[PDB]
Amino acid sequence: GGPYIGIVADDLTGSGDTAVQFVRAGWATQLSVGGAEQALADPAVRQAEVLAVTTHSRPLAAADAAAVVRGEVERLRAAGVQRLYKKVDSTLRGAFKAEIDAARLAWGEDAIAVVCPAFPVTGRTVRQGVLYVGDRPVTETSAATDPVTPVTESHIPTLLGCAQLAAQAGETPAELARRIAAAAPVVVVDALDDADVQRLARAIGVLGQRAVPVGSGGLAAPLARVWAGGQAAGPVLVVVTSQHSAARQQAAALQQAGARTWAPTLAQLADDRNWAAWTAEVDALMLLAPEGRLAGLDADSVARRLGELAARLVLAHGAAGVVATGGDGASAVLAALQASGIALVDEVTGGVPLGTLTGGQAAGLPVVTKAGGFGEQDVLIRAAQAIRERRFT
Ligand SMILES: [Cl-]
């Protein structure tokens, strides 16, 4: 409750663009067309999870720019904000170093400014610490002669007087996080693509409150998602009843990715002792249907049964959400939880909707449903991640 994330942007366009990315990840987000004071006095900030402000400081001189930035960062911290994102130009225009030092110092003594202004979908990347626009350093482009605030140094570590890192080939977020901490208090991190940006955002998540990302629009949605994921509780439960090959391939992929999987035979599925032993034994869990029907029962007995067990697990142990494919499975899971329907929120991808259960014993639980034959191989992985990386209120 109350403001959790503060976004400080140096111009109006950037503030609005970054803020909508948080809205799109489920965060209740408030935007000031000026500074934060106005916003924080209002009792409507009790409501808001994310507060975005503009310092209108991009064309200002260093000491004036620094001044406005330190004052807003103080107000946000005073107000209970626990994550800070500083939104800058992808192409470095502004009192870049001045604002970064002022922000980091105001945030905390142990604060780390993690600087990566990449925005890959618009062609900005960070390469051995250099801000590239397409295939050239930014100082070889029009911005070296921006009428208002030219750019005169492309190598961000030189600009800031700091260290520089790049994720290694197969590096994990946790491994990357260790190296950023070692490079405190200010470090530039490379990124060529969204995958690189997401890895960095995850590392930043691992580092928690002390980690102050400094980025452009490229870092916005990844941070919205990672910080939302930190609020997910319990495993995502995935129930796969389809015998469509697409679903079996999708299940195989989710298992490959580390989901703990119950894959019983027809005989085991009808044996409550087998269920009991698996549940005792056990960020995703998967129940995988065998082909056919349970001995002595219904043509729909396998899905009905998986639905009932999934519901038992959600109520007894808890879950961050449920993903069900295909339609047979989704119907069985909702029926077992006595859900009337799904209040829609958004989607994983078109045809794979995300909502919350309405009615019944698990009202509010995030749910994703999908037809058995639908989607690419990674779609259940993506579905589970979608649940985790959305803020629900
Ligand atoms: Cl199905």
CA-nearest of 325, 281, 280, 320 to 307 is 325
CA of 314 to the centre of ligand 1 (A): 21
**Number of residues that make up the chain:** 393
Contact yes or no for 380/240 (Cβ under 8 A): yes
Q: Could you tell me which residues come within 8 angstroms of residue 324 by beta carbon, excluding any fewer than 6 positions away?
A: 238, 239, 241, 310, 330, 332, 333, 334, 367, 368, 369, 370
CA of 245 to the centre of ligand 1 (A): 11
CA atoms within 13 A on the CB side of 8: 32
- Are 363 and 339 spatial neighbours (Cβ–Cβ below 8 Å)? yes
Which distant-in-sequence residues (6+ apart) come within 8 Å of 174 by Cβ? 203, 206
* Rounded Cα distance, 69 and 94, in Å: 12
Tell how far the Cα of 380 is from the centroid of ligand 1, in angstroms: 14
CA-closest candidate to residue 6, choices 86, 71, 69, 105: 86
Contact 289/332 with Cβ under 8 angstroms? no
Residues near ion ligand 1 (CB < 5 Å) are 242, 326, 328, 372
Q: What is d(CA 13, CA 333) in angstroms, rounded to the nearest whole number?
A: 44
Cβ neighbours around 109 below 10 Å, total: 8
Q: How many angstroms separate the alpha carbon of residue 352 from the centre of ligand 1? A: 14
36 Cβ partners below 8 Å, 6+ apart? 6, 51, 53, 72, 75, 76, 79
CB atoms within 10 A of CB 61: 11
Write phi, then psi, for 173 (nearest 5 degrees).
-55, -40
For residue 50, CA distances in Å to 54, 79, 119, 213, 320 come to 14, 12, 22, 15, 22
Cα–Cα distance for residue pair 281/21, rounded to 1 Å:
39
Q: How was this structure determined?
A: X-ray
How remote is the CA of residue 241 from the centroid of ligand 1, in Å? Answer: 6
Using alpha carbons, select from 232, 235, 321 the residue that is nearest to residue 283. Answer: 235
Strands 29-31 and 50-54: parallel
329 C-alpha vs ligand 1 centroid, how far in Å? 6
Domain spans in the chain, listed from the N-terminal domain onward? 1-231, 232-393
Q: In angstroms, rounded to a whole number, what is the distance separating the alpha carbons of residues 101 and 164?
A: 16
| Residues 387 and 368 sit within 8 Å (Cβ to Cβ) | yes
Residues ≥6 apart with Cβ < 8 Å to 194: 120, 121, 218, 222
